[PDB]
Design a binder for this molecule. Sequence first.
Ligand SMILES: Cc1ccc(/C=C2/C(=O)Nc3ccccc32)o1
Length: 335
Amino acid sequence: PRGSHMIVKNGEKWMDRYEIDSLIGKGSFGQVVKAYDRVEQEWVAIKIIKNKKAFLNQAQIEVRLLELMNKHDTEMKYYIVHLKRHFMFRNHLCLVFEMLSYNLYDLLRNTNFRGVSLNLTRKFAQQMCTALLFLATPELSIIHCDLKPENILLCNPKRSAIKIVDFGSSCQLGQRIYQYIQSRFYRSPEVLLGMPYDLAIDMWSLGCILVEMHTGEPLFSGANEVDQMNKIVEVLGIPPAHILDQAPKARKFFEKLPDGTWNLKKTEYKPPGTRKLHNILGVETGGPGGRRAGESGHTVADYLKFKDLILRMLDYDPKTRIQPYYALQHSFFKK
Ligand SMILES: Cc1ccc(/C=C2/C(=O)Nc3ccccc32)o1
């Protein structure tokens, strides 16, 4: 066999059922194939976990969480990708999902990274907040741990309905296992600081995502952890002392002074909290790059609500950071 990836061969039939069409995707997780399920007469995406002990063990958690989420039949569970079944094949765990359309990063690429409208952004935000509310159900208490444009797919290319995919790093509250999680751009302060985390890290990622969906570019595009914390401090200032006092990796980015206060451990950036979200969104200057100037649904009053909700989702404190239910009650969502 030689190596971790399954030899994929377009046109072969798996177990007189799955007709392999093409390789959808590759990556560290393994691979994804488009396949025709002859039994159910429908296209499916099969996620082939790498044949490595570490990846197989993590994929048992993925399968457990997915099955748990699909079992909870309610008014929230259809913002989550549906795992139809799974099987072992050629020493690979294989997860069969419904076929969906493209991810929100592709939607950004098809606007030449100009960003989508505030109106489309709000539709994505209401779906995602609803999804996070569902994850926050006691019985689930699921932390996604990897929200980013790539992991939010459109159901249909013509419509704005979405689902969340890739619960490959997901854990339940109280079952934290990796000190290093989240895609860097969407990584919460508590994680960069190497502290314990809860469902609040998803709400952080969602704040970063919504800004990027409208501006067409990442809010915080760090080359590494130091650069990432610095780009956050640029907008949000130095994080509160009560947090940095309890933070194992505080001294990676910050310095205590005789004072008792924290400062950036400078070795260069805009001063702390001087990169205003106000200016990044271009509230009073016609939106991102001036492209929404005079457009309907891009008034200053619209922007101020959006910005307010973003700033509640980018709260440094995970205890006071806005939680799904309260986010859905925000004026930004009101008719
Ligand atoms: C294309 C498509 C439809 C459904 C899925 C599922 C995926 C998942 O759960 N993790 C992934 C990670 C990378 C790419 C795709 C997926 O992928």
